[PDB]
Amino acid sequence: MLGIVIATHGALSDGAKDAATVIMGATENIETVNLNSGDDVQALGGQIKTAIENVQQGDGVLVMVDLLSASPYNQAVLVINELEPALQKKIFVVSGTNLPMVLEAINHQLLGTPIAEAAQAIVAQGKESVQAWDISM
Amino acid sequence: MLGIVIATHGALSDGAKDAATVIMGATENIETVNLNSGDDVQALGGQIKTAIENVQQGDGVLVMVDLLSASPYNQAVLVINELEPALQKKIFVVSGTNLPMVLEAINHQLLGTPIAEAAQAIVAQGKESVQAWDISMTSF
Ligand SMILES: [Ca+2]
Numbered sequence: 505m506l507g508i509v510i511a512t513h514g515a516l517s518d519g520a521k522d523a524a525t526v527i528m529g530a531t532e533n534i535e536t537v538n539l540n541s542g543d544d545v546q547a548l549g550g551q552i553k554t555a556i557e558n559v560q561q562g563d564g565v566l567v568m569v570d571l572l573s574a575s576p577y578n579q580a581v582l583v584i585n586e587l588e589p590a591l592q593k594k595i596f597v598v599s600g601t602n603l604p605m606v607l608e609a610i611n612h613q614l615l616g617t618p619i620a621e622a623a624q625a626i627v628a629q630g631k632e633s634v635q636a637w638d639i640s641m
Numbered sequence: 642m643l644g645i646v647i648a649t650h651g652a653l654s655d656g657a658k659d660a661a662t663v664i665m666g667a668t669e670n671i672e673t674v675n676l677n678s679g680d681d682v683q684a685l686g687g688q689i690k691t692a693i694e695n696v697q698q699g700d701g702v703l704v705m706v707d708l709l710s711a712s713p714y715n716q717a718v719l720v721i722n723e724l725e726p727a728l729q730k731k732i733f734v735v736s737g738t739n740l741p742m743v744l745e746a747i748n749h750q751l752l753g754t755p756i757a758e759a760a761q762a763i764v765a766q767g768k769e770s771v772q773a774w775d776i777s778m779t780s781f
């Protein structure tokens with residue numbers, strides 16, 4: 505089954521995962537990594553690899569991060585570079601991660617969707633799910 | 642000062658503020674609401690209304706929910722629909738909030754950006770922030 509690793513600053517990863525459980529009832533094969541104040545980013549790389557390895561079942565791993573170009577994103581990309589080219593081509597990194605994206609990801613987990621096709625699907629959803637509303641509409 | 646109310650299923654709203662705190666330091670005028678397994682949605686209605694009121698200061702309020710068309714969102718709308726006219730015109734609801742949208746919101750809070758203008762900018766950055774990277778982009 506597709507693996508998911510949500511990596512972020514603070515407890516955002518645990519929260520996104522908590523929110524998905526409230527909506528779905530349960531979740532499976534989803535690890536969360538947190539970068540806290542005073543954490544050495546040197547170690548984040550290690551926690552991200554451990555997590556990826558803990559969800560790899562042979563269908564790839566979706567590494568969902570919070571902020572493009574921030575530490576979680578950087579370390580994720582850098583760790584991927586040091587893995588066997590085999591899974592290396594099955595690991596995708598999505599940024600700007602939001603609940604709709606995590607839900608879409610879980611959806612592909614259940615569907616068995618090939619990760620490359622899943623990644624695009626998640627990116628579309630995420631973007632399309634960002635809109636504003638006001639009383640004038 | 643612009644007010645912000647992050648409302649989500651579970652602890653997501655608290656995790657977003659924590660993450661944003663980790664990056665920008667101590668924030669101000671940000672309320673977090675949660676909808677947990679078992680909670681009554683009407684109660685969430687009042688919870689949002691309260692958060693909105695504890696943060697409303699003349700410059701409007703950004704209500705950041707997690708998912709479009711779900712209880713947090715639907716209740717935000719129901720609440721805003723029954724608010725006194727001088728207040729409702731300035732409350733905006735943005736969906737699919739991610740860390741970048743929150744950080745962007747905190748920035749407009751500091752700039753004093755007019756809310757209708759801040760909302761459009763938060764949506765643009767939010768959409769722009771969603772991307773995917775894979776080893777093929779680095780392989781030649
Ligand atoms: Ca964890």
Ligand SMILES: [Ca+2]
Nearest residue numbers: 672673674675
């Ligand atoms: Ca709160």
Ligand SMILES: [Ca+2]
Nearest residue numbers: 691694695696
């Ligand atoms: Ca008060």
